[PDB]
């Protein structure tokens, strides 16, 4: 499901200037901290495509191992606890971690 790469910071330092997984975070962080309650039908956006947008932005080495740096930014500490598995198939859908960094 993942692979197995530290290094010092970069790929992160240039996720935060190219929020890459973000906007795909809020769609599981939706359901993470949202007031379910609806009166009418639903509601909710869709940001598949502005994360597999940044994502490529990166670099395909800042397709692993910075993702790890997402969920540790100023915005995913425990409420990433989901969007960890669920942003573990969604980058790897688009072939940005799908099997690169391995051990």
Known sequence: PYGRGRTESGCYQQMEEAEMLNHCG???????????????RMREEDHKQLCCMQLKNLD???????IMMMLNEPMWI???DQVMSMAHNLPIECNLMSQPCQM
Not at 26 to 40: A, D, H, I, T
């Open 26 to 40: 809020m769609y599981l962080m939706k359901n993470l901290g949202e007031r379910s309650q609806v009166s009418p």
């Open 78 to 80: 425990r409420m990433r």
């Open 60 to 66: 395909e080495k800042c397709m692993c191992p910075a």
